[PDB]
Amino acid sequence: NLSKFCIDMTAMAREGKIDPVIGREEEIRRVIRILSRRTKNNPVLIGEPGVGKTTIVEGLAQRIVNADVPDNLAACKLLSLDVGALVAGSKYRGEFEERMKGVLKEIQESKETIILFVDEIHLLMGLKPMLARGQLHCIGATTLAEYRKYIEKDAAFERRFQQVLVKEPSITETISILRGLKEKYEVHHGVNIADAAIVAAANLAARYLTSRRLPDSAVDLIDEAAAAVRVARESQPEIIDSLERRLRQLKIEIHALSREKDEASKARLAQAKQDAQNVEEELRPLREKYERERQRGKAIQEAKMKLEALRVKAEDASRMGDHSRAADLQYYAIPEQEAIIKRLEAEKAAADSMITDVVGPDQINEIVARWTGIPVTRLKTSEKEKLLHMEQALSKIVVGQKEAVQSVSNAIRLQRSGLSNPNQPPSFLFCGPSGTGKTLLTKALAEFLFDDPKSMIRFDMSEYQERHSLSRMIGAPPGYVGHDAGGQLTEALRRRPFSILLFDEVEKAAKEVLTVLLQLMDDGRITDGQGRVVDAKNCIVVMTSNLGAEYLSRAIDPTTRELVMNTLRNYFLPEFLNRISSIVIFNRLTRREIRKIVDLRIAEIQKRLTDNDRNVTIKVSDEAKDKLGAQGYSPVYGARPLQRLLEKEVLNRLAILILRGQIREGEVACVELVDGKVQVLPNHPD
Amino acid sequence: NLSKFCIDMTAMAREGKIDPVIGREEEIRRVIRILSRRTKNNPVLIGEPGVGKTTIVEGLAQRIVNADVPDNLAACKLLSLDVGALVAGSKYRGEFEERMKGVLKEIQESKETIILFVDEIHLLMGLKPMLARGQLHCIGATTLAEYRKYIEKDAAFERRFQQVLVKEPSITETISILRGLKEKYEVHHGVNIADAAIVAAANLAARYLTSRRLPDSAVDLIDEAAAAVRVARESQPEIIDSLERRLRQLKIEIHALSREKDEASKARLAQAKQDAQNVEEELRPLREKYERERQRGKAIQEAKMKLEALRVKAEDASRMGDHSRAADLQYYAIPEQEAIIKRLEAEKAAADSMITDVVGPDQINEIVARWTGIPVTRLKTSEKEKLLHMEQALSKIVVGQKEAVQSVSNAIRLQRSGLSNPNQPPSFLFCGPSGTGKTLLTKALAEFLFDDPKSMIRFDMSEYQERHSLSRMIGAPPGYVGHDAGGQLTEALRRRPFSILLFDEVEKAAKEVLTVLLQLMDDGRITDGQGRVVDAKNCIVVMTSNLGAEYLSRAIDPTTRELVMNTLRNYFLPEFLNRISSIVIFNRLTRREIRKIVDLRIAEIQKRLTDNDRNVTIKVSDEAKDKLGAQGYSPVYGARPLQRLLEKEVLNRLAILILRGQIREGEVACVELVDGKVQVLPNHPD
Amino acid sequence: NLSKFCIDMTAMAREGKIDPVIGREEEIRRVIRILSRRTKNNPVLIGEPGVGKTTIVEGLAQRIVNADVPDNLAACKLLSLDVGALVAGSKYRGEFEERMKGVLKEIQESKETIILFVDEIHLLMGLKPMLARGQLHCIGATTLAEYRKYIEKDAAFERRFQQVLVKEPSITETISILRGLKEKYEVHHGVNIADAAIVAAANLAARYLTSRRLPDSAVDLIDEAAAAVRVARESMITDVVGPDQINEIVARWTGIPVTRLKTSEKEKLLHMEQALSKIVVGQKEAVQSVSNAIRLQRSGLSNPNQPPSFLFCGPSGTGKTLLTKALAEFLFDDPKSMIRFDMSEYQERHSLSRMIGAPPGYVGHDAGGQLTEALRRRPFSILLFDEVEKAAKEVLTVLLQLMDDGRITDGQGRVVDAKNCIVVMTSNLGAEYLSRAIDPTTRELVMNTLRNYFLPEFLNRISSIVIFNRLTRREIRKIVDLRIAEIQKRLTDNDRNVTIKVSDEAKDKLGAQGYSPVYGARPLQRLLEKEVLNRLAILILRGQIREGEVACVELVDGKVQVLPNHPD
Structure with missing residues (x-):
């Protein structure tokens, strides 16, 4: 055949x-x-x-x-x-x-x-x-x-x-299939596992290692974890291998002295004899307990082997009708095997590198870390404490609208708490003058809530004001020319659902893409031109405005708030407009916060200094900062210009004297000003 | 089986x-x-x-x-x-x-x-x-x-x-593994090497021999060094082999004197033969010293080989049950024979003005030169000396935009300083009239930085307003031609990581090509049709425009520069123009510097003359250069027409007079502007 | 074993x-x-x-x-x-x-x-x-x-x-290699030779026989010399080898008088105008221009890697084609050394594949490389191109990347050598500005209407800028006389001898007639040829004008006609 x-x-x-x-x-x-x-x-x-x-x-x-x-x-x-x-x-x-x-x-x-x-x-x-x-x-x-x-x-x-x-199962379904195969895998490694680790690990793979899909992903995660920990138990303990290398060199010394004949040789001969003694009568306890655990786990494995073999044979016979042997085998060999296993467990419990054969969540954490280099610190955070601290946390990144911050905070809180539509993710549409760090606000947001730069995307609607621009950006059904490029937006949703969504020039947008985004808001996903309606529940979606900011006088009043209220209700469907998490606004920028930003600037400068060994001591006179700020504010870009302005206007002479070394090691960057013109002063000429 | x-x-x-x-x-x-x-x-x-x-x-x-x-x-x-x-x-x-x-x-x-x-x-x-x-x-x-x-x-x-x-290994790791190798490699060829020399060598290969990768390449380099050593000897000592060069010359004397049939020739033949005997009597002692010490080295290494043999023998013996034999062997046969071999080593070291025969940075450098042909002095200047003296050497090529020289110099510092963005390569958008040597500026710039013409590549967006052009410029998935030849930028970066990248008339670019370039500015690498990324941190970029010619009217004024800034803001993205390193500016040429570059041209000319046998000085009248400039200043295209103008005007008549017989060698090219046209005074008639 | x-x-x-x-x-x-x-x-x-x-x-x-x-x-x-x-x-x-x-x-x-x-x-x-x-x-x-x-x-x-x-051996090194071989071969034959003649021979094999490779080729030469000897010395006294026998053999492999080879290549340089005049007439300015250009080339004072290039602006055949010909047969001394290329078929992008090639997996790439094998087999040659402005811009791109560097990539994956080539673009895109007469404006008009066509710097890597004209009626008649001269030559080739007597009247007649604003009167060459060859052969095979009997090429009643010397 x-x-x-x-x-x-x-x-x-x-x-x-x-x-x-x-x-x-x-x-x-x-x-x-x-x-x-x-x-x-x-x-x-x-x-x-x-x-x-x-x-x-x-x-x-x-x-x-x-x-x-x-x-x-x-x-x-x-x-x-x-x-x-x-x-x-x-x-x-x-x-x-x-x-x-x-x-x-x-x-x-x-x-x-x-x-x-x-x-x-x-x-x-x-x-x-x-x-x-x-x-x-x-x-x-x-x-x-x-x-x-x-x-x-x-x-x-x-x-x-x-x-x-085929629907892709979810967290609970993982929990199921994983709890199932837990025993099988533990046997195949002769190991133990606890559950909470499994739960977390599942969630974690679901969050970050996402180039593949549930659930087999978290499965092989378990796999590698168990392998690593089984390798450690299979391997000799660090004290054991050091002991053994030691005693090898010890008998080396012993006999090498047994060759020579002088009093020092015999002295260190007896001494190394005592050394090899001590180490051997100490290891054979530890050596032998190691061996004993080897034997225990061994017996465990083979007992599970014969146990499941009997189980499957008996199930077959029951499916056949071989009642006599079936019953006798069952109610004789199963119970004695259970007894074997339980006394094995008792002796292992009484055995108290002595590594806990049970795996730990921290293990998976280290594994996923080396999977993505992401700091282990941020991982073991349950996505909850960060919530109870995010507000001030991000305040420590930029300042200027405490209220906007706490607002978006409450928004995402209400999302994660599950106290709203559980399918339409929160949505965001800003307005106000650039320069604050609006972009940077979103950036810190992401790298705090998803901990990645690339978690951000970019969309600028001048590029998306043609209906065919909409077509290409969402991609086209394969029957069209868009089949060779697809939808960058769509494909981005595909690769990394847990990510952030930027949108800008929204006033300069085509109405149709505006509407499909409105859908996305109310859809929590997008029906592609192909059928793969890809979720958005892992997304964050922001739109930008600067139009009504012409109202912004330095000063918060409700008056102008209604000004821009109308100034937007005109622009878009008020129903559409009802789909932000909440109206997102800004304000002007008083000097005090600007010079605070200057402090942050010289701060990252000193940070750059710390990047290498070079000690440099930035002494920004108050008036230095004062002039810097008072100058570089942009009525159109705030400090975005002033940032690079001061960058240049210090870094130049700094690197000048650095190349020159005239300001030598451990010296002081006395940031000075000369008659309305900033000028750091070299500690010395050549 | x-x-x-x-x-x-x-x-x-x-x-x-x-x-x-x-x-x-x-x-x-x-x-x-x-x-x-x-x-x-x-x-x-x-x-x-x-x-x-x-x-x-x-x-x-x-x-x-x-x-x-x-x-x-x-x-x-x-x-x-x-x-x-x-x-x-x-x-x-x-x-x-x-x-x-x-x-x-x-x-x-x-x-x-x-x-x-x-x-x-x-x-x-x-x-x-x-x-x-x-x-x-x-x-x-x-x-x-x-x-x-x-x-x-x-x-x-x-x-x-x-x-x-497999991540690419790094330099320090190279140094380490190369120490490891160095041990055995010298054992293979019994000549010591300066560690620091090896460090250099590695950095060198890393900087230039991008054909292969680290570290295997620098490995081969060390091997080439050992080779150069073993060939400066002839399975001999090295000074002995140079005295053998002298001895071969002495044998040349012996034969050229046996060639002559007289008495003094035979006597100086005997002189050369006595010299041969003396170079032999010094050849031998150190030569047998070399043979003996390489025998000592093989003694060492075979002792270590037997050491490994008995070591792993005790290992697999404890595996089998015969650890005592190999134990005793290690105990006794190993240390004593190793000690006597070390004694031979010490006595031969005792057998050792003075002369060196071990490796040094020099020979490495010489070999790498031979491999690329770059001057040894050019290699050893170090990205430090050029920074202290670049501006000078650059002025030695073209001048006029001293400010921009200064600027780009500070930029290169910033890079080498590291205080700036540790990854963002430098970036400069040229603005000014063509026809001075902007091109030439960057050319000599690079050939001072990386010391390579081909280290420069030029690109013009004239053929980039199309999508397929973007593809070809970067590549594409296999169902295309972009896969074939990939992309110019990526293929170049591979073929040479250190480089400068020209993008002229960029104002005409397709804004998505502009996008990928901006990425390059802000990635340190680029994502391609294959997705793979290739670092450009060790590279820089060039892009030019010539709009300001409107504002071009000599007197440096600021008011125009902001006009230009907005002129290009409306052309690109604000942050794009900010993710740059520095803005670039040019202008027209002072008639004096005009005449100066003409003097440089005539210097080139006389240089080409002394290249050949024609030692014909030239009396370039002031009127000659004045008129040549008054003509060749093309307010449309700068003086890039001017050198061609002058050479067509005079150089032709020069060669004509020289070859037709109107000039004999050593003459003076007493050339004079006569009635708006420069006609050299005929040095000799037709 | x-x-x-x-x-x-x-x-x-x-x-x-x-x-x-x-x-x-x-x-x-x-x-x-x-x-x-x-x-x-x-x-x-x-x-x-x-x-x-x-x-x-x-x-x-x-x-x-x-x-x-x-x-x-x-x-x-x-x-x-x-x-x-x-x-x-x-x-x-x-x-x-x-x-x-x-x-x-x-x-x-x-x-x-x-x-x-x-x-x-x-x-x-x-x-x-x-x-x-x-x-x-x-x-x-x-x-x-x-x-x-x-x-x-x-x-x-x-x-x-x-x-x-291994690398190509130096010409000076080859002479040294020959030296060390000299005595050996001489022993093998019992001969002697002058080192300088040997050096000459070496240089000759360099300039020709590119089929072969130095130095072993030059060896082969010396072997042939020894052969001629082992004939002669054993067939005062003839024992050694002069340049003569070298020359015999280089001729026997090229069919050229030693004269054209015993040259030193300087007198020809100093007297190219002579030959040209005796071949082509009408563009003396361009004659001397290209002469000094190629001199500068050979002078060494030129750029060491910038082979020449010469702009053409005028009708075709007027001498410029004949010019290119004479250039070949006089400088490199071979007619076939010219390789025409009609850019009218190279106005296509795929013509790049068809000429130099493209990535290996194409249909045009096999047609490409026409320049590659050309230069490999003919270093000393010239590259003709016609009406290049119409050719596709990538064609002109690769042509430029050749002419500047004296080397260009090919579709096969290599960059050929061109250190003995000459760039030739030919058209008359503005020649119609002209009459039978020189005005710089129409000249400058073409200057603009051509420098516009590309990067004017693309035209400013050309070794020069050169135009043509509409020949004067008198020099029109001059080239007519040249024609009738070669025709009387053809007559003398066969034993039938008859005197071409072209009346100045018939001269003017034919000239003006065939003179056309398209090619001047190059087709008139064949026209007048029909006018004469026909009648003369008629009377030749009829038995009217016998040997020596006159051919008064005379214009009768506005229609040139040879008077039949003896009616049938």
Whole structure:
């Protein structure tokens, strides 16, 4: 028989080597209905890669072999066969097609109803399975795109098929499947785990390592964690290996002195004999407890092995009816094995590097850290304390609208508390003069709430005032030219959902993209031109304005607030306008805060000084700062100009004397001013 | 036992036949972890060609042989693959399929857990060993390119592997691992090397030999140094070999004197032969000293080899139960023989005005010059001396915009200072009239900085207002031509990391090309059609405009500069014009500096004259240059027409007179403006 | 012992059967260095056919035999199999590989230090001793191309090797190499030669026979000299070799009088106007202009890497085509040295692929490179291009990137040499501004209407700026007289002898007639030819105008007609 390429699922099912599936049953029954459906028997599943749609097929087969299934299909069997393996048969398609017809017939001339799951089904593209008229069955599963690319472009084949979707499970579903496979994996490493670590780890992978999808992601996370900790238990303790290297060098010394004959040699001979003694009679306690734990875990492993083997054999026999041996094996070998395990556990509990075989969340934390280099500190923060401190925290970054800060704070608070629409994320639309750090405000926001620069994006609506600009920016359905670039916005949502959304020049926008953004607000997602309606619940969305700022006199009054109220209600649909978290405003910039910013400026300057060993002592006279500020305020950009202004107007002469070294190590940057012109004074000429 | 293709690494390990390896350890530990995992034991590596990926594998094996790996690995046998051998078997799948299975089968025939690392794994893709998970075990390694080409195609492998890239090592790490090597390398060629020399050498290769990567390159450099040494000797001493050069010259004397048939010739032949005897009597003592000391070195290294032999012998003896034999060997045979070899070393060191024969920075520098041909003095100036004297040398090329010289100089300082943005490369937008040498300015600038014409590249947005042009300028996904040739910027940055980047007439650019350039300004690198990023921190950029010509009317005035600033604000983004390093400004030329650059031209001319045999001085009348300038000042195109003007005007008649016979050598080109046209006074008639 | 396939160079070294070329020592040093490369001992030499880098390895063997080598290499036996020596005894690749193993067994047998060489060593790819860790030593050489084709593929091999470029030998160095060979060959034949004549010969082989390669080509020359001798001396007294015989042979391979070769190339320079006048007439200004330009070229005072270039503005054939011709046949002394190129077909972007090439996987790239093989086979030549302004802008781009640098990339992936080329663009985009008469305005008008067409600096890398005119009626008649002269020549070619008597009346008639504002009267050449050849041959095959009998080419009643001397 040419079962060469085939793999009998039902075999391992009876064998029980297949992993125990969990959850997602209604889908299974849907599959069933599709099978017994006459017109198009074809279950053709679709989902994102890696999710182990495979796992789902196998779980259905598992449910099958228990015979609690469609009767007309209970007598049927399932098996896999890699299409790549079939085309691995030969090099050329011609001789290959002989193998293929062999496949189609070999199953055809099979007097027992058995079905094949054609994984990666689309690869039929590269046909013969027009033989499908009920005499046979298949099972389809592959990604959406290529399905639309080839299957959707074949009527006859497809009018005989029925797309099946795959929802991506959520946190709780992880919790389920992970708690399930916990025992299996712990055995395969002979280890222990606690739950809260699993919970966190799941959430964490969900948050940051997101180039892949739930849930197998957090699974392999568990994997690597357990591997690392199992490597540590498998490895000798640091005291043990140091002891052993020591004693090796100790017997080295002992005998090297046994060669020489002089009183010092014999002295350190006896001394190194005592050394090797001490170390050996100390290690053999620790050495032997290490060995004992090795043996304990060993016995544990093999006991679980025979335990589950008996379990699967007994389940098989019960499915058969071999009652006598089934019952005796069950109520004899299971209980004694339980006793074995419980006395093993008792002795391990009494055993008190002695590492806790149980893993810890901190472990996963370190792992994800080296996965993304992100400071471990920020991770172990539950996203709650930061909330109870974010307000003043970000105040410590920029100042100027305490009220705006605390407002957006309350907004995100009400989001995370879950006291609103749980699907439409909070939305933001600013107004006021640039220079404050509005951008920078959002920036600190992100790197505090997602802890990443790239978490920010940028959108400037002059670039988005043509309807076709909208088209390209959201991408177009594959039937259009936008198929080669797609939607940068959309694709950004894809790659990193937990991120931030900037929008600017919104006054200069096209009305249509304005409306699709309004939808996004009320949608919490966007129906792409392709069908992948990608969530936004992990997003933050900001729009910019500076128009009414012409009202801003240095001074907060409600009067001007209503001024710009109308000044905006005119601009956009008041219903649309009802979709901000709350109206976001600004104000003028009194001198005091500006010179405070100057203090922050000289601060980051001293920071740059600290970046290297160079001690430099910035002495900004009060009046220095005073002139700096009083000069560089921009009625159009505030200190954004003044920033680089002072940057130049110090860094120049600073680096001058630095290159010159005339102001030497440990010296003082006496930041001086000369008659209305700032001039730091060199401690010396050449 | 098809060991025809089995090739063990642990063997050469067991004889120290591969040197130790430094750093990279956390990598190894990660690899171990992955090998332990239950999901996809087989990890994958990504890095630059042959950069020591192999070294990581073999060093892991080294760790193995000396009892640090865990038990599962303590039971591992590991080896490399006759990959190319099976690629070289037969051009059709055929029998190397079958031999491949045989060894694959031969794998199953295993006492302990056999591990087969494989490189180039793409070679099997462009599926056969899809048979047994758990039986076989490899490690993955190739180029990221190959990763996406074949790794990411077969979903099976995609679930069956996990990648671990390889960051490029850094310079200090180079220094360390090179000390390590240095030990064994000198042992191979018995000549000492200044550590600091090696440090230089590494930095040098890093700065210029971008063909390969760090550190292998600088390794080869040290090797070239050892080579230059061993060839300054001839398996000899080096001063002995230079006296052998002198002795070969003495033999030339001997033969050229036997050539002459007289008595004094034979007498001075005997003189040369006595000199030959004396150079021999000094040749010998130090030559046999050299032979003896290299024999002493092999004594040392074979003593260390036996040391490793007995060490690992005591290791696998405690594994078997015979640690006493190798124990005693280490105890007694090792220290005493090592001591007597050290005694031979001390006595030969005692056998040692004065003369040097060990490596120094000089020879390294000379070799790198020979490799690139750059002057040794140019290498050794250091990014410090030029900063103290650049402005001078630059003025030695063109002048007039002294302010801008100063400015760009401070900018380069800032970079080298590091006090500025530690990553943002410098950036300067040229503004002024063409026809002075803005181009020339930047040219000589670079050739003073990196000392390379080709270190400069020029770009003009005239062919960039299109999308496909942006693509070609950066590249594209494979379904395009942008993949072919990639992008000019990225390909250049690769081909030369240190450079300057001209973008002339940028005011005509497509604003999305402007966007990618702005990224370059603010990334330190760039994301491409392949997504990969290449650092430009060690690079700078150039872009020019010529709008201000409106305001161009000589007297430096500020009022115009803000007009220009807004003129370009309306052309680009505000922050874009702020993410720059500094604004650039130009102007017209003073008639005096005009005449000056003309004097420089005629200097070039007389230089070209003394290049050939024509020593014809030129009496360029004041009127000559005055009229030439009055003509050649093109208010449209500066004086970039002027040199051509003057050469067409005079140089032609010059060469004409010189060759037609109107000039004999050594003459004076007494050239004089006569009636609006400069006609040199005929030095000799037709 | 299957050491037959290799050859112990060190043996003939001991037997002294070897004669070292000299120079290139530094390269041999490089070799030694890599022979000390503990990492990749095996280098790879790279050069060109004829240079017989075999020479180089033999010289290394020389430095072996006299014990003048690094002793780490003292006992090394240097032998070299031929890959062909194994292509012969091969009933199949297995048997090929069989003998491979067999010798390699003897080879891998580590008796003493031994080093191998293989010519065309790339051929081993298309290998078996990939087993070679470097415990052994080898060396080889080939062209860059197949090296990149085969050795670039494997990581292992390519890494184990070191690419070394032999480089082109200096002309002065070749004379020194000839010297060292002189006595040897003379012994081989019993002859003597003047060193200076030999130097001449060298320079000649340089200027021609580019098919071959120095210096071994110049050797071949000297061998031919010795041959002529071994004829003569054995057929006062004739015993030595003058330049004469060299000249005989260079002629026998080019068909040119020694006169045109015994030149020193200065008088021709000083008298190009003479020849031109005797060929072309009507643009004396451009004549002297280009003369001084190419002089400056040869003067050395020119830019060392700026080959010439000459603007054309005037009708076609008027002499300018004939000009280009004379330029070739007088400077480089070959008609075919001109390679036309109609830019009218190069107004397309794909014409870049069609001319120089494009990325290798295209259809036009194979047509490309027309300049590449041209220069490789013809260094001393000229590059004609017609109405270039219409040609595609990337075509003009690559043409510029040639003319400035005297070198340009190709679609194949290389930058050819052009240090003996001449740039030629030709059109009459503003010639219609003119009459039969010179006014600088119309001249300056064309100046503008052409400098506009591109970067005027693109025109300002041209060696000059040159126009043409509409010939004067009198010099029109002059070139007419030239024509009728070559026609009477053609008459004298065959024994039928008849006197062309072109009346000044018929002269004016034909001239003015064929004079047209398009090409002047170049088609009139064929027109008047029809007018004469027809009638003269009519009377030739009729028996009217016999030998010597006059051909009064006379204009009768506004229609030129030769009066039939004797009616039928």
